[PDB]
Amino acid sequence: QDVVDLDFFTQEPLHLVSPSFLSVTIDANLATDPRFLILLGSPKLRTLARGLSPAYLRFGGTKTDFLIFDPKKE
Amino acid sequence: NSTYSRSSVDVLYTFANCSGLDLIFGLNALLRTADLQWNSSNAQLLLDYCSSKGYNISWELGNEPNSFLKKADIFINGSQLGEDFIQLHKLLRKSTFKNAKLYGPDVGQPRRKTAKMLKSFLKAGGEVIDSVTWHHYYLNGRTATREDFLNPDVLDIFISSVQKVFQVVESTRPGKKVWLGETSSAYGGGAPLLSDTFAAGFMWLDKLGLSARMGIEVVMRQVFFGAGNYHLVDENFDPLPDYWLSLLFKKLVGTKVLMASVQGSKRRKLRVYLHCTNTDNPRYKEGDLTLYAINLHNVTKYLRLPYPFSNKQVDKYLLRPLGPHGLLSKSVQLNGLTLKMVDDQTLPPLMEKPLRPGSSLGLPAFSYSFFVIRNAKVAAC
Numbered sequence A: 001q002d003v004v005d006l007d008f009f010t011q012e013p014l015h016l017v018s019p020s021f022l023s024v025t026i027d028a029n030l031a032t033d034p035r036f037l038i039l040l041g042s043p044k045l046r047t048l049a050r051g052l053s054p055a056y057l058r059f060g061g062t063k064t065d066f067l068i069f070d071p072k073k074e
Numbered sequence B: 001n002s003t004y005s006r007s008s009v010d011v012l013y014t015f016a017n018c019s020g021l022d023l024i025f026g027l028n029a030l031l032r033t034a035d036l037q038w039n040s041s042n043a044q045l046l047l048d049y050c051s052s053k054g055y056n057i058s059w060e061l062g063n064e065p066n067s068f069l070k071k072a073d074i075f076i077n078g079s080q081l082g083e084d085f086i087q088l089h090k091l092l093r094k095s096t097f098k099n100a101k102l103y104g105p106d107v108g109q110p111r112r113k114t115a116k117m118l119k120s121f122l123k124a125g126g127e128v129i130d131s132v133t134w135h136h137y138y139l140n141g142r143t144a145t146r147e148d149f150l151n152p153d154v155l156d157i158f159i160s161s162v163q164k165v166f167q168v169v170e171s172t173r174p175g176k177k178v179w180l181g182e183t184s185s186a187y188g189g190g191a192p193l194l195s196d197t198f199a200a201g202f203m204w205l206d207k208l209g210l211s212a213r214m215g216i217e218v219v220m221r222q223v224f225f226g227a228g229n230y231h232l233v234d235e236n237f238d239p240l241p242d243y244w245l246s247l248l249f250k251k252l253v254g255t256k257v258l259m260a261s262v263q264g265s266k267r268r269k270l271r272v273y274l275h276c277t278n279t280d281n282p283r284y285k286e287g288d289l290t291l292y293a294i295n296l297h298n299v300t301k302y303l304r305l306p307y308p309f310s311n312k313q314v315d316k317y318l319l320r321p322l323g324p325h326g327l328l329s330k331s332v333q334l335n336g337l338t339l340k341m342v343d344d345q346t347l348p349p350l351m352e353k354p355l356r357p358g359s360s361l362g363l364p365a366f367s368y369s370f371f372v373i374r375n376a377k378v379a380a381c
């Protein structure tokens, strides 16, 4: 039968998560794309990202161990 | 290896700051001193530029260090990585903010090999980190199927991964905060025509459910935008059903975690979660409760709210696929209304259905919904 009764625990909070609990990543490999400049400049994408604030944005990935900072590059 | 530009950093930062985001940047862990010690020079450069620019940014060092050997034929034990983290920590404190954060070590999920590395790392480097980071995926994308996404046994494996992580962390750094650092449905860039659908939502919402209930303080989704099918936003900057689910979650679900459970208690297919209502939402007060639920049955189920909540007014936020492709669909409706952007600068209202007070909660086959118990008056919340 299709009716299910639920138990709840409401005495005290069992865990306290960050207001940033639901967060996202950008894979480090996206820096091997030639269109990196264009894609992150997109106002539409920035709008979507703002609907997810507050949150952490993690830039890393497998490619983290293969990016070399070069000061003479732009 | 590839090189990146100050130009790249500026854009990446600006996109974070204009999006109201705290960026965390992972640093290259495979640059090494002759004796296998981590050379700090490239990061030092990058740290100085970012110091030069006044960017408030947070840092990681290395990714999936359990895999360096298959991935680069260099083996780094945790202790070593632990020393390396201490060095990174020296450098950030010396620099401009220095009250800025550091997380790690981003090892892949509980594997009998990976636990050893994390344990050894938390002994040596447990002292400098502000949170512990690990990764989790449910399937291999290349071989993942559609039933998997609907299989409650697949969902539940996640729990032993979690129990195993806290098993390691409690042995070394209790009171230390734990983060899902990189996580998703299927590895290898995602399962094609699955990881980007309404069906992907059973996994994602259950992952947030289980993590909150089991002490994970932050869950970082692979990815927001990109190549992989597991993106929240597609190739043409269109929001996928996980993006709409994720919005709804942020606006409705609070930081204070509670518990709900089903009195039936056998089948694994009806998953339920309970938090305080996110107070920040202008429609609610404090003391209200936010219930989210997944139904993996092939028929509709109706939930009864318990005493003394059986007679309260409930806003229901039901999500179902927009046809014709159903669960493999890349569009999703809320309470029967398709969800789309108004235009490129503007999100629509997410509108509830005010339910009847005392009505049981209809949850149809293969659906997920939120229910906010209005006028709940719980004291913890």
Ligand SMILES: O=C(O)[C@@H]1[C@@H](O)[C@H](O)[C@@H](O)c2nccn21
Binding pocket: A027, A061, A062, A063, B063, B064, B135, B137, B182, B186, B187, B188, B189, B190, B228
């Ligand atoms: O293969 C993937 O989908 C991603 C892959 O794309 C990421 O770069 C890597 O960090 C990873 N670990 C587990 C899964 N993944």
